[model samples]
Target: SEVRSDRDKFVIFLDVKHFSPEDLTVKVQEDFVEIHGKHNERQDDHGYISREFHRRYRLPSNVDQSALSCSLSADGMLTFSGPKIPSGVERAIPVSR
Candidate 1:
């Protein structure tokens, strides 16, 4: 019964005016997901913010990494669809760059 709605997975919704193309990067880090975006208040200066976009769930070590898929839209909605995280105890996992 524990599941996430479409709105729950992505919460980068904010009153952002503009963003530079290079300033947009959303990725999954170790034990967390991060969203790096910017709101250009002025042409001379840029306003940037980082958000812990999603929570980490326990995953099985035998899971398929290639199955991890993600999609993004211009409306600021990002989605990740992998094998719905493993529910039992798993080995320690770490995400590295």
Candidate 2:
């Protein structure tokens, strides 16, 4: 192994998150919108998936079905977007993060 004068460095990667919650056939949180993440009814336990029930967001405010969306990462990384404005683009976030 050998190393010289390198001046650039960057690191970025993706990883898995959720392993349970029947990430396949369990009912999807689609039609019911938020608060419907009840993937598990609980009561019985399947050899592979005992004590069910998965994940769901608490649901934000002033959110209509307009621009609602969910982004899935290579991992179970969940991201939600939507929610309307406070009626002032000139005030919010000031342009960039």
Candidate 3:
């Protein structure tokens, strides 16, 4: 897996080489990203292939969930990217002395 972060944008990449777009599902929630993939039994050149996986990632508060996007590359590299809210970066914590 790979992650890239910047001041205004963020991207995440993962491997789903064995799964196809038809078998993969991506879900985005307020503060979470979910990935689910399931491949039915199928015969390959050497043997039968079967798989299923569920992966979930917590989103930073600065992430714009509405603009988040997901896509799988031709080589089966799953990628997710979104813009971040600039104002959400620095926080002022109150302290009582």
Candidate 4:
């Protein structure tokens, strides 16, 4: 431990921009949301994963496929919520006998 005139200063790094949804782009559709991320990767002659990579998932299905919506944020997290449709409306009214 250095003494006398040597002391580590607690420095606070000022971040002008914090991570947010702006970090990523999400395309929402009726069935699923397409998450798009861009990364730079350099591959040598060997043709292997040389650098960063981009990952995408179709996402697991929990809600009814009939109705789907998605919300995404930074830090790589996506949520899909489906509102329940009344049973009576789910099916077309039967023709009068």
Instruction: Give each model's whole-structure lDDT.
Output: 0.43, 0.34, 0.85, 0.37
Models 1 onward score TM values of 0.36, 0.37, 0.77, 0.29
lDDT of 4 at 36: 48
Where does candidate 3 clash, by residue pair?
none
Q: Please say which candidate is ahead in lDDT: 2 or 3.
A: 3
Which candidate comes out best when scored by lDDT?
Answer: 3
RMSD of 1: 11.6
For residue 70, what is the lDDT in candidate 3? 90
Q: Can you rank all candidates by TM-score, best first?
A: 3, 2, 1, 4
lDDT of 2 by residue, 67-96 (tens): 555444665544444544343433234467
What does the lDDT read for residue 17 in candidate 4?
24
Write model 3 residue lDDT over 10-89, tens digit each, in one string.
Answer: 88898999888999988887677888999877476767767999988877778887798899999999999999987933
RMSD values, in order shown: 11.6, 13.7, 8.3, 21.3
Question: Per-residue lDDT for 56 in model 2?
Answer: 38
lDDT of 3 at 94: 68
| Residues 6-92 of candidate 4: C-alpha lDDT, one tens digit per residue | 121111111212224444455545444455444434468856432222333332334344555544544444443444333442434
Residue 84, candidate 2: C-alpha displacement in angstroms: 1.3
lDDT of 3: 0.85
State the lDDT of candidate 1 residue by residue for 13-58, as single tens digits: 3322244445456555453445556443433356544432223443
> Pick by TM-score: which candidate is best?
3
| Backbone clash total, candidate 3 | 0
User: Which lDDT value does model 2 have at 1?
Assistant: 10
- Candidate 1 stretches with Cα past 4 Å from truth are 1-22, 41-66, 85-97
